[PDB]
């Protein structure tokens, strides 16, 4: 995304879509970003054709339109998103399988008096990860979502 995209402009040259690495993959908006990036590049070149200049003085307006629109603001937002997800390996390793066994125990009726299912869920969540890991991970991801 933001840390890895190229210069999206140059002398008589513009770069759109995934070639400029404009993808919000956590919201799955890549074609959202691509179809807009074509519109911003084509409106940049339509400015470049009435003036007749195609160098980096006029074609830098494409990079200005790219951050005045949603495309680069969605990239700045989830900038440190996958390096956040790489340094846990918990949100897809214990966290779904623990939320499934907790909600199964919540809906299972086996004569257990509903305080001993409210504590068996607590004995489920505070066994695969400590409470210093649960309350940390809710806001450690909060930095990834900004």
Ligand X SMILES: Cc1cc2nc3c(=O)[nH]c(=O)nc-3n(C[C@H](O)[C@H](O)[C@H](O)COP(=O)(O)OP(=O)(O)OC[C@H]3O[C@@H](n4cnc5c(N)ncnc54)[C@H](O)[C@@H]3O)c2cc1C
- By C-beta, is 27 or 87 nearer to ligand X? 27
Contact flag: residue 120 with a copy of itself (CB under 8 A): no
Inter-axis angle of helices 131-140 and 118-128, to 10 degrees?
Answer: 80
Nearest residue to ligand X, by Cβ distance, number only: 30
**Please, what sign has the CA dihedral across residues 99, 102, 106, 110?**
positive
Contacted by 131, from ligand X, other proteins, ligand MQ7, none: CB < 5 to 8 Å by type: none
Total number of residues that touch a copy of itself (CB under 8 A): 19
* Three-state SS at 72: helix
Contact flag: residue 28 with ligand X (CB under 6 A): yes
How many Å apart are CA 143 and CA 122, to the nearest integer? 26
Contact flag: residue 96 with other proteins (CB under 8 A): yes
* Site residues, a copy of itself (CB under 8 A): 24, 27, 29, 32, 36, 69-70, 73-74, 77, 109, 111-115, 118, 145-146
């Amino acid at each position: 995304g933001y840390y890895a995209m190229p210069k999206v402009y140059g002398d008589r040259v513009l770069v759109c879509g995934d070639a400029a690495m404009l993808v919000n993959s956590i919201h799955r908006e890549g074609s959202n970003h691509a179809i807009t990036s074509g519109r911003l590049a084509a409106e940049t070149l339509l400015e470049a054709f009435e003036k007749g200049d195609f160098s980096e003085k006029i074609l830098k307006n494409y990079y200005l339109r790219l951050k005045e629109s949603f495309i680069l603001k969605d990239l700045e937002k989830y900038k440190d998103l996958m390096p956040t997800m790489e340094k846990n390996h918990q949100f897809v390793e214990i966290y779904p399988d623990l939320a499934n066994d907790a909600l199964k125990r919540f809906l299972q009726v086996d004569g257990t008096p509903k305080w001993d299912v409210q504590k068996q869920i607590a004995d489920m969540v505070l066994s695969r990860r400590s409470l210093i890991g649960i309350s940390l991970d809710l806001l450690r991801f909060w930095r990834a979502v900004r």
